[PDB]
Amino acid sequence: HMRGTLRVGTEATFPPFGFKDENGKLVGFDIDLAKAIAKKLGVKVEFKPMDFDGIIPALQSGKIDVVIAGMTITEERKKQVDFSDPYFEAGQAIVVKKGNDSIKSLEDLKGKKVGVQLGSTSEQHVKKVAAGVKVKKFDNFSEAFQELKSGRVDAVVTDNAVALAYVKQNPNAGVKIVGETFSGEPYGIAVRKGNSELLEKINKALEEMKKDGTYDKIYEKWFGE
Numbered sequence: 001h002m003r004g005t006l007r008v009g010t011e012a013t014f015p016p017f018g019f020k021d022e023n024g025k026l027v028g029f030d031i032d033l034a035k036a037i038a039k040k041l042g043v044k045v046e047f048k049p050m051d052f053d054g055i056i057p058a059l060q061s062g063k064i065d066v067v068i069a070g071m072t073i074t075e076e077r078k079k080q081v082d083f084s085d086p087y088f089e090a091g092q093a094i095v096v097k098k099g100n101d102s103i104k105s106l107e108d109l110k111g112k113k114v115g116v117q118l119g120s121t122s123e124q125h126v127k128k129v130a131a132g133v134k135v136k137k138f139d140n141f142s143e144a145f146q147e148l149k150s151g152r153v154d155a156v157v158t159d160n161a162v163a164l165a166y167v168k169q170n171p172n173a174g175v176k177i178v179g180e181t182f183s184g185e186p187y188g189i190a191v192r193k194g195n196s197e198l199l200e201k202i203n204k205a206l207e208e209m210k211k212d213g214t215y216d217k218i219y220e221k222w223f224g225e
């Protein structure tokens with residue numbers, strides 16, 4: 001059976017991928033991508049915004065049909081979900097106060113307080129470098145960034161376009177990006193393991209979108225030429 005409604009697990013605090021406009025509506029690159037894929041499949045989207053660490057459980061337990069949530073494809077995750085072909089390539093970045101000149105890389109988080117999203121690749125990357133780093137873990141990244149603003153952490157680590165977005169969205173916070181890398185986090189759309197019928201349709205849609213202009217129009221909307 002082809003579901004007429006695809007329940008899409010997504011972010012709500014992960015600009016420019018999944019966040020809320022000024023009327024509380026979900027927007028972002030992943031929101032636009034989901035709608036485009038749904039249109040090619042002939043179905044409607046129902047978004048389920050949720051904290052990231054609950055996304056794999058949601059998909060495995062049948063709360064959602066698909067994940068478009070800035071989710072990096074990893075070999076370990078492929079034991080938990082099936083992924084589409086990659087739809088985006090991200091990197092990493094660290095956000096610090098403008099005043100700070102001690103932190104230029106993950107190496108420099110030595111004996112510092114650092115915030116990360118629970119369940120993220122960022123959390124894995126920082127766990128590795130931590131040399132006595134004090135890691136604080138958050139249910140969503142807006143909470144992490146809250147603690148940076150208040151001085152509860154000295155840095156927050158996330159995907160590079162989200163770090164940039166937080167900086168652009170918060171001039172009054174007097175923050176800046178350091179340690180930026182540009183690749184190494186391929187994003188994929190995930191479906192339940194063994195849902196080959198839906199995965200094939202999603203792959204085909206993505207391939208068509210990259211051919212026909214649809215993908216490149218979404219990319220330009222969010223990132224420019």
Ligand SMILES: NC(=O)CC[C@H](N)C(=O)O
Nearest residue numbers: 069070071072117120121
């Ligand atoms: N929504 C997120 O926080 C995802 C971050 C990272 N790309 C990952 O897959 O862990």
